Design a protein around this ligand. Structure first.
Ligand SMILES: *[C@@H]1O[C@H](CO)[C@@H](O[C@@H]2O[C@H](C(=O)O)[C@@H](O)[C@H](O)[C@H]2O)[C@H](O)[C@H]1O
Ligand SMILES: *[C@@H]1O[C@H](CO)[C@@H](O[C@@H]2O[C@H](C(=O)O)[C@@H](O)[C@H](O)[C@H]2O)[C@H](O)[C@H]1O
Ligand SMILES: *[C@@H]1O[C@H](CO)[C@@H](O[C@@H]2O[C@H](C(=O)O)[C@@H](O)[C@H](O)[C@H]2O)[C@H](O)[C@H]1O
Lengths: 178, 37, 45
């Protein structure tokens, strides 16, 4: 009688242990996948960043109408994608967030390739892509002295602030280095 | 259950480093523009 | 890449192999490679 009851408690012990173990491994599996998720995401948050080589601007009449940004990968970065980035434009007048535009822009920005295959994705360290924003389509065409705070933000999370400072004089200067 | 506690703390250590990691870079970003000007 | 900011045009120059147009070409002055700086004494024009 006692032995029969022990076996019933035994098999119930087996099932309870299996469920407890099953919960343990399944929770471990969830945290393993979650734990793996942050390792790549946080490293891409830290490593993957935009690096701005230069910032020039076209000058028509007497005001800067196009703003040109040449960008590249950071040190030891993965594939930065410039079509999933959102540049922030805090200008002298307006203050909006620029999204990427195809073809084109207006309140959006376009990316033309300078060196490399892709014209929107930085694959290797040597690829350079030019970021195009219409200054006369986001606000008034930038005149002399105007300053723009440009915050390029990667998809994974990065910040490359560049204070595009228009030169104090545009006297007979077709293109100027902001 | 010792491994489960490790995993949650593992995740916490990752963001805490990531939170700390940002501050130097974004501060260096502000000073890189301030120094250049 | 060489960023040319001249009185008129203002573009970024890539590399070619002809003397070019909107590119630049490199001719070795002192050394083996005509495109790669390997030693401290290498000069390429
Ligand atoms: C930033 O890059 C833009 C890439 O399209 C340049 O765009 C061209 O500018 C020319 C001129 O205004 O300089 C126009 O004739 C082209 O149609 C226009 O695509 C822009 O000039 C430059 O600042
Ligand atoms: C860079 O980011 C782009 C953001 O739109 C990606 O764009 C998509 O790419 C898909 C495919 O992988 O080619 C297309 O089916 C989508 O229509 C296109 O928007 C791009 O892939 C990525 O490299
Ligand atoms: C020489 O000094 C002038 C002082 O008035 C400047 O003139 C102003 O320039 C502004 C801008 O910087 O382009 C315009 O918005 C003003 O309307 C204009 O009077 C001039 O620019 C400067 O070179």
């Amino acid at each position: 009688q006692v032995g029969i009851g022990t076996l019933i408690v035994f098999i119930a012990m087996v099932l309870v242990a299996a469920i407890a173990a099953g919960v343990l491994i399944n929770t471990a599996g969830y945290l393993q996948s979650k734990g793996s998720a942050t390792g790549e995401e946080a490293s891409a948050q830290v490593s993957n960043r935009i690096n701005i080589v230069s910032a020039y601007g076209n000058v028509x009449x007497x005001x800067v109408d196009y703003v040109n940004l040449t960008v590249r990968q950071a040190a030891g970065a993965d594939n930065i994608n410039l079509x999933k980035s959102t540049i922030q434009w805090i200008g002298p007048d307006x203050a909006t967030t620029l999204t990427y535009x195809x073809x084109x822009x207006x309140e959006n920005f376009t990316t033309x390739s300078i060196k490399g295959x892709x014209x929107x994705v930085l694959v290797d360290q040597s690829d350079r892509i030019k970021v195009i924003m219409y200054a006369x389509x986001v606000x008034x065409x930038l005149x002399x002295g105007x300053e723009v705070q440009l915050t390029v933000t990667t998809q994974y999370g990065s910040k490359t602030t560049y204070w595009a400072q228009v030169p104090e004089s545009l006297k007979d200067k077709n293109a100027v280095x902001l």
